Structure formats: structure tokens, C-alpha cells
Ligand binder design. Structure first.
Ligand SMILES: [Zn+2]
Ligand SMILES: [Zn+2]
Lengths: 113, 541, 119, 96
């Protein structure tokens, strides 16, 4: 996806490989001009998943899933059974630890497993 | 009749604090209401069905109660019912005489044997409230904008004395407050249903000393500069153990005794500049910490010159004799003028060791001294540096357990509640990190036992050229294998229980035998947790 | 049947101890330390309601007590709820400042008997 | 309302209730997998950035359907209390 124009006729260069040369070269089909390639990179693309242009708003693609909610646990500060549970790592601990977030709009309490 | 705060039973939900305040001031006297607060279930828009009102004077409260009993209070077709409240909105004394404004506050200690008082730091325009019901006295000090609250309980003050500053024996312009324990220190931090009549919309969090020179930490007495106050004697007569005698003091220039270090009440080492022994210096410092001999009375050149050249045993005997008396000694030099191997065998026979015990408080530090107690396993192989071991515990000013509110007070910031560490938390961390420097020694953290964790106590060992704290720590074992903070500390402090010595067992007489484990219903149940086997010959040995 | 003895998941760090996290753990043990109040609350609640040690409140108190007694080994706070505090004390307590209520359980009978014997 | 003062109090109360409901909806919108690092009990320095962007929450809610449904549910739950104020500020003789 790297396009460059040769200095002679200002036309697009096509990458090619020569077994004898054992080096990357660029030569356009308009003039018999060959230049030494740089950085040895013929394709560089940042991976993106935005293949559905102008369609992700009307149709719910669910790119960011909602966290699950459970009613078995009971909050400490308030007697509310609804909470949000998820797995995340601690500041320096190793592994995944279950976390809880209270769903009461007036409580705002979070605790670990 | 104890307090002036009254709880109103039923009020209309549509009203605001201003309307109720206007109604009360119309029915009662003008501006006779101090604090009016209506609790809200929500943040600022859902008030409750009741309210609490604090009156300025008890007579207004009695009149309001009489009006309520006669059903003469009708505010928006609602009959207000008045009842007693559990607590006051603002801890403010009812008596206007107790409230003292714009008075000079100074701290110090009885530096000289005679009636001489040394002033460390003087604060002007402080506020003093005497709360008889709460059995405490509040001092509000404004320093660099933010104000601080100093609370002195009745138990803290051991005796009350009255003095004069103008120089007239008949006049009484000062009051000495001999404090045994340190005072609590607070700090101020930064409306539709709260009138409050003033700017009391803040909170108090416990903090360390705010003085630059740490005058409060090194001062065991408080002096209240006041006017003639002929009628003030009756108010000051309520303080416990009041002396009905007239005494005069003399101000002494004692601004030299100012330490910027965290550990305030310790003596300066550069003043000595000699080869003074560590044990005698520690005993003298512990005596100074106790309410026996003042700092300036023990910092004189004559006393240290006398104590420098003398037999060690007689010096220790006279020091413990001076410490044993309950009465305060003003001139220890006159007292000491008028007055005039085994550790290893004790360890082997009953494990008797003299362990130094230290108490760390937010205001100051208390040294108990070489108290005899039982011995652990570490001192068995480290019986040379007995004085290097020091037991350090963290308590409050009254030597009680630190409350949870004094460390990491909760606060709601943002969406969730995030705790905010107090200055006492940082002070404890700094003490654990830097360590305690007593005389020609510096104590570092070794470990804490399982029992000491509950008691908020820890062991500290002074590093020496032959052996350091890290040397002992690595001699005990390698704890890097443990990846759990609690588990590693528990294992490191596990080998500190008292035990009796016996013969040494080599590493070649060992064996590995399989254990038993059964898993039923998806539960791991192990029978062999700490069981073992022993022979009869080994048991006899 | 007895309660389950399954403890909390251990917390393993990705690096060695730098001698500061142990200090942080020691200082943080002073806060969120409800070992002594859980037993008193459980005793008061058992004294108050009938069929003691059978309701879910007593089971929750026992679970909290187990989690608090496991705090010394595993760094898991007990998280004592505010609504579970007793707020009332029987006659056989030294908290004279706190409100004292008359107890009619076996402990109250023992206290009445010992008071009558000493008087 | 009985008088003008009651009407003013009701208006202020409604405004504060609507503000509280909006804040509740903003808090509820965070219950997604993208904020699991912020919702955990740790040390995050981006606490102020979550509350500084007030106008971005509306744009995010309008673009996402799941976020819109969550915000609607939270708004109804918070607005039940606001609707409850009519009984406090309403007379018994009111025809409605
Ligand atoms: Zn070309
Ligand atoms: Zn909750």
C-alpha cells in the first residue's frame, strides 16, 4: 500500500524482487528506471475493523457489550440485591479477580470478591 | 435540659429552612435561633418530615417547649411538636461567658525549678470553648488561613493553676493547664435547607501537629493568656483538680528548643558532643517523657557533667529511684546530689530479657524503658544486642487503639466513594520508613508477629556494624518465594513466639512421607494439615 | 451441617516485595478491622430475636467473622455493613455510655442471678 | 401550589431532581466493558476526566442504542421520585 513516483517520469512504481540482486527494487513500466528501495517495507497498514461505513449507527453492532448484572449478591452499605460483576486485574496482582459495583443510584459502592 | 437542640416532629414538605426560621423568630424572640437543619433523603431536593433546631439560650428552648405543649405553634396548618434531640448541630456551649474570643494561646513546660515558664510558640486571637457536658475544651487556632481545632479532655489535665502576666499578684491574667496526655489536633477542609447563622459548613479530620517548630508535640503544659477576669475563676473552678492558690510565673526565652524532625520530644545529640553512654541517655529521655523532669531541667550542663563521670550501677539506681516517685521533681541535680554475663544465664534459665518498649502517638512518642519480659527465638542467637531490640506500638494520645476514623476518612468524590488518607497515615508510613532515631542508634523495621498485628505493635532492631536488620532478616530465611503480602509478613513474623531451647537436629535425619487427601462433593478436604510423628527416645531427650 | 471452610482467592503479585507494600498492609490493617465488633453484634442479635443462630442474619455474621479471622492470613477486608450494627446492649456489658436494654434470655437470667447473689 | 413561594420551591426542586437524574444516567452509562479498568478498585488519575466531559455523554448516548436503552431505564427509575413530588405539593381537593 506504499505508493511512490519515480524521479524521471513521475509515474507510479511497482515493487519487485530479483533473485540475483537479493534486494528490493522499484521500477515503473513507463521508463526503464530502477531505484534502490528504502526501509524494505512494501505494505504497512494499521489494523482497523471499520469495514461497515455509515452503517454502525442505524444498526446496533454491539461493539461495546454491557456488563452483566446479578441479584444474588447483597450490598454492604445498602440492602440492595442488584450489582454489576466483572473480571479485571488489580494494580499489581497477577490473574483475574472478580469485582462488584452496586446498582443503587444513591449508593455508589464497589467491592471485590 | 442538658442541651439546647430541639427536634421538631412534623413540618410541611413544601417549606424551606428560611420560612421555618422566620416563623420561629416571629413567634419567639428575634434572632434567638442559632442552627436550623432539615435532613434530606436525596442530595439537595428531598427534605424529610422532621427538622432539628438549636436555640441560643436555654430560656428560649423552655419557652418554645411551653408553646409547643399548649399547641400555640401553627405553621402552615401544621402543629409543630417539639422533642429533645440526641445531639447538637454544632458543639457550642450555651453560656456566653464560657465562649472566649481573641485570647493569646501559648505552650511550654516548667523549664526551671522555680516559678519560671518557657514559651515555645504563641498564638494570638484563638477561640476557646468550654463544654461541660462533653468534658472537653476546644481551642480554635487560625494559622496561615486554615484553622485547626485542639481538644483537651478533662482527664488530660491533671491540675489547674491560675497565674498573672501583667506582674500584679492580686490580678489573675493567666491559667496554667498541666496536661498528662497529648491533645487531639484537627484541621478544617473545604445550603438551601441549612441556615446555621454562620460559616460552619465544613468537616474536621484528625491531623498531626501543624506547628513549624512542632511546639505542641514538645509541650506538656498550656497557658491561657486572658484579661483580669474576676468572675472567670468560677468558670475555671469547674476544671478537675483546681488549685485555689495564687502563683506567678516568669517568661523565659526558650525558643532554642525547637526540633523540625518528626520525633519531637527527644533530646538533641549535638548538644552533648561526647562519648555519653546510650543506656543512661535512654533512661534520661524516658524520664523526660514521663511527667517527672522537664526537658530544660534535664538539658543543663551541670547535670550531664555530674552524670558523665560516675559508677554505672549507682547511676542506674539513682535514675530508677528518681523515676519511681509519683511526685514531680523540679531540681533533679539537688536530688542526685542528696542521694549520694547475667543476660545469657537469665536467657538460658527462664528467657528473661530487658526489652525497650516505645509508644508512637500522633502528637509525641512515649518510651516505657527497659521493662523485663519474656524472650523469643531471635534473641537466643542475637543475645549480644539486647538494647537494639525495641518494641514499637501505634496508639492514640490516651494510649488506646487508633479509631478507624483517624486513618483514611471516607469521602465521596466523583461517581464513587474514594477514601482519603489522613496526615496520621502518612506520619505512620514515614515513621515506618525512616525509623526512630534514639541517641546514637537508628531502629529499622524487622517484622511483626501474628499477635502483634492485632495489637498494632512491631519489632525494631538498631543496625550495627557487625549485624544489621537485613542480616537478621536473611538469617531467618528467604521470603522471596512468597508472592502474597500478608502471607510473607505472617511467615516472617511467625518465628517470634516464646519457646524453650533444646538440642539441635541436623538436616540429614529427615524423611518425606506421603499425606492423605480426599475430594468429596467437589471439595478439597485434607486430613494432614499440621500433624506429625515423634519417637519415644526423641520425646525423652 | 457445618458451614463451608472455603477461603478467599489468594492475591499473588507479579513482582517481589519492595518492603513498602508490607508496611502498607500493616497500616491498612488498622482500618477495616471489624474482628471485635462482629462477635458483639452477633451476640446482641442472638439475644434479641428468638430461634437464635438459625436466621440468615446469624449465618451472615458467622461468614463475616470467618472472613475477618482470615484477614490475618489473606488480605481480604471484612466489610462490616452499617445496618448490622447492634445499637442496643444488654445488662451484662461494660458500655455504660451506650444505651442499655433489659435482656430476658439465659444470659440475662444468669446476670440477674449473680446480681441477686452478690447483693 | 398554595402560593407563589410554594411554586418557586417546586420549580427549584424539579430542577435539582432533573439534574440528579441526569447525573444518575451518566453514571449508569459507564457500565460497559470499556471502563472496567476505571470501575475496579484501584488508583486511576482519570477520575476528573470522567466528570469533565458532560456534553460528550449525550453524544455517546445518541449514537449507541444499548446506551440509549440503559439511559432511558435509569432516567425512568430516577424520575419516579420526581413524579412522587406531586403528592407532597398537591392538595386533596385537586381534581387531577
Ligand atoms: Zn518512470
Ligand atoms: Zn449499595
Amino acid at each position: 500500500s506504499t505508493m511512490k513516483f519515480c524521479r524521471e517520469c513521475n509515474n507510479i512504481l511497482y515493487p519487485k524482487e530479483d533473485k540475483e540482486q537479493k534486494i528490493l527494487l522499484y521500477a515503473c513500466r513507463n521508463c526503464d528506471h530502477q531505484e534502490v528501495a528504502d526501509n524494505s517495507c512494501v505494505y504497512r497498514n494499521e489494523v482497523h475493523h471499520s469495514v461497515s461505513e455509515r452503517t454502525q449507527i442505524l444498526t446496533d453492532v454491539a461493539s461495546d457489550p454491557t456488563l452483566p448484572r446479578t441479584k444474588a449478591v447483597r450490598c454492604s452499605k445498602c440492602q440492595h440485591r442488584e450489582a454489576v460483576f466483572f473480571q479485571a486485574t488489580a494494580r499489581g496482582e497477577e490473574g483475574m479477580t472478580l469485582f462488584f459495583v452496586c446498582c443503587n443510584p444513591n449508593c455508589g459502592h464497589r467491592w471485590r470478591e | 435540659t442538658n442541651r439546647s437542640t430541639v427536634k421538631i416532629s412534623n413540618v410541611p414538605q413544601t417549606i424551606v429552612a428560611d420560612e421555618l426560621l422566620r416563623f420561629l423568630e416571629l413567634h419567639l424572640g428575634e434572632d434567638t435561633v442559632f442552627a436550623l437543619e432539615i435532613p434530606t433523603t436525596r442530595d439537595n431536593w428531598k427534605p424529610r418530615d422532621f427538622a432539628r433546631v438549636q436555640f441560643t439560650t436555654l430560656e428560649v428552648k423552655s419557652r418554645a417547649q411551653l408553646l409547643s405543649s399548649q399547641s400555640k405553634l401553627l405553621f402552615k396548618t401544621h402543629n409543630l411538636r417539639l422533642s429533645e434531640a440526641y445531639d447538637d448541630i454544632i458543639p457550642r456551649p450555651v453560656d456566653p461567658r464560657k465562649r472566649l474570643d481573641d485570647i493569646v494561646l501559648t505552650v511550654g513546660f516548667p523549664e526551671s525549678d522555680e516559678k519560671r515558664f518557657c514559651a515555645l510558640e504563641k498564638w494570638d486571637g484563638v477561640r476557646c470553648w468550654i463544654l461541660t457536658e462533653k468534658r472537653r475544651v476546644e481551642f480554635w487556632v487560625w494559622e496561615s488561613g486554615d484553622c485547626y481545632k485542639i481538644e483537651v479532655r478533662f482527664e488530660d489535665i491533671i491540675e489547674t493553676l491560675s497565674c498573672c502576666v501583667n506582674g500584679d499578684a492580686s490580678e489573675i491574667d493567666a491559667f496554667l493547664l498541666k496536661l498528662k496526655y497529648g491533645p487531639k489536633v484537627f484541621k478544617r477542609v473545604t445550603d438551601r435547607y441549612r441556615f446555621c447563622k454562620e460559616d460552619f459548613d465544613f468537616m474536621w479530620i484528625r491531623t498531626t501537629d501543624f506547628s513549624g517548630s512542632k511546639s505542641i508535640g514538645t509541650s506538656t503544659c498550656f497557658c491561657l493568656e486572658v484579661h483580669n477576669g474576676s468572675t472567670m475563676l468560677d468558670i475555671f473552678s469547674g476544671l478537675p483538680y483546681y488549685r485555689e492558690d495564687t502563683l506567678s510565673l516568669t517568661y523565659v526565652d526558650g525558643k532554642t528548643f525547637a526540633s523540625a524532625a518528626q520525633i519531637v520530644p527527644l533530646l538533641n545529640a549535638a548538644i552533648l558532643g561526647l562519648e555519653f553512654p546510650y543506656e543512661i541517655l535512654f533512661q534520661l529521655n524516658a524520664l523526660v517523657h514521663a511527667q517527672k523532669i522537664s526537658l530544660f531541667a534535664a538539658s543543663d550542663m551541670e547535670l550531664i557533667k555530674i552524670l558523665r563521670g560516675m559508677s554505672l550501677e549507682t547511676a542506674l539506681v539513682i535514675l530508677k529511684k528518681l523515676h519511681q516517685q509519683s511526685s514531680i521533681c523540679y531540681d533533679p541535680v539537688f536530688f542526685v546530689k542528696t542521694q549520694m554475663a547475667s543476660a545469657y544465664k537469665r536467657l538460658t534459665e527462664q528467657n528473661i530479657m530487658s526489652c525497650q518498649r516505645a509508644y508512637v502517638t500522633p502528637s509525641k512518642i512515649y518510651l516505657l524503658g527497659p521493662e523485663l519480659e519474656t524472650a523469643n527465638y531471635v534473641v537466643k542467637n542475637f543475645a549480644e544486642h539486647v538494647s537494639d531490640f525495641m518494641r514499637v506500638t501505634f496508639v492514640e494520645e490516651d494510649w488506646s487503639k487508633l479509631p478507624a476514623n483517624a486513618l483514611s476518612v471516607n469521602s465521596k468524590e466523583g461517581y464513587f466513594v474514594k477514601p482519603s488518607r489522613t496526615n496520621i497515615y502518612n506520619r505512620v508510613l514515614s515513621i515506618l520508613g525512616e525509623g526512630i532515631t534514639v541517641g546514637p542508634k537508628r531502629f529499622e523495621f524487622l517484622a511483626f508477629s501474628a499477635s502483634q498485628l492485632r495489637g498494632n505493635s512491631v519489632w525494631m532492631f538498631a543496625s550495627n556494624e557487625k549485624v544489621k536488620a537485613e542480616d537478621i532478616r536473611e538469617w531467618m530465611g528467604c521470603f522471596r518465594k512468597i508472592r502474597s503480602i500478608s502471607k510473607c509478613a505472617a511467615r516472617m513474623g511467625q518465628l517470634f513466639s516464646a519457646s524453650r531451647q533444646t538440642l539441635i537436629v541436623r538436616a540429614q535425619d529427615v524423611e518425606q512421607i506421603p499425606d492423605i487427601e480426599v475430594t468429596t462433593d467437589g471439595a478439597d478436604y485434607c486430613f494432614s494439615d499440621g500433624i506429625g510423628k515423634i519417637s519415644l527416645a526423641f520425646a525423652k531427650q | 451441617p457445618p458451614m463451608d471452610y472455603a477461603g478467599s482467592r489468594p492475591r499473588l503479585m507479579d513482582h517481589d516485595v519492595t518492603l513498602e507494600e508490607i508496611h502498607k498492609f500493616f497500616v491498612d490493617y488498622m482500618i477495616s478491622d471489624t474482628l471485635g465488633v462482629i462477635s458483639t453484634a452477633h451476640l446482641v442479635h442472638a439475644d434479641r430475636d428468638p430461634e437464635k443462630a438459625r436466621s440468615q442474619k446469624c449465618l451472615e455474621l458467622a461468614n463475616l467473622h470467618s472472613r475477618a479471622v482470615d484477614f490475618a492470613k489473606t488480605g481480604a477486608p471484612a466489610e462490616m455493613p452499617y445496618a448490622l450494627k447492634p445499637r442496643e446492649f444488654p445488662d451484662f456489658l461494660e458500655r455504660f455510655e451506650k444505651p442499655t436494654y433489659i435482656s430476658e434470655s439465659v444470659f440475662g437470667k444468669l446476670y440477674r442471678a449473680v446480681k441477686s447473689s452478690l447483693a | 401550589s398554595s402560593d407563589l413561594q410554594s411554586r418557586k420551591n417546586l420549580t427549584e426542586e424539579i430542577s435539582y431532581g432533573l439534574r440528579e437524574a441526569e447525573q444518575v444516567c451518566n453514571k449508569q452509562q459507564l457500565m460497559v466493558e470499556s471502563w472496567r479498568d476505571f470501575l475496579a478498585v484501584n488508583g486511576e488519575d482519570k477520575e476528573e476526566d470522567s466528570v469533565s466531559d458532560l456534553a460528550r455523554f449525550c453524544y455517546e448516548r445518541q449514537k449507541s442504542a444499548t446506551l440509549s436503552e440503559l439511559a432511558v431505564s435509569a432516567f425512568k427509575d430516577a424520575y419516579r421520585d420526581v413524579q412522587a413530588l406531586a403528592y407532597r405539593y398537591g392538595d386533596q381537593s385537586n381534581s387531577f
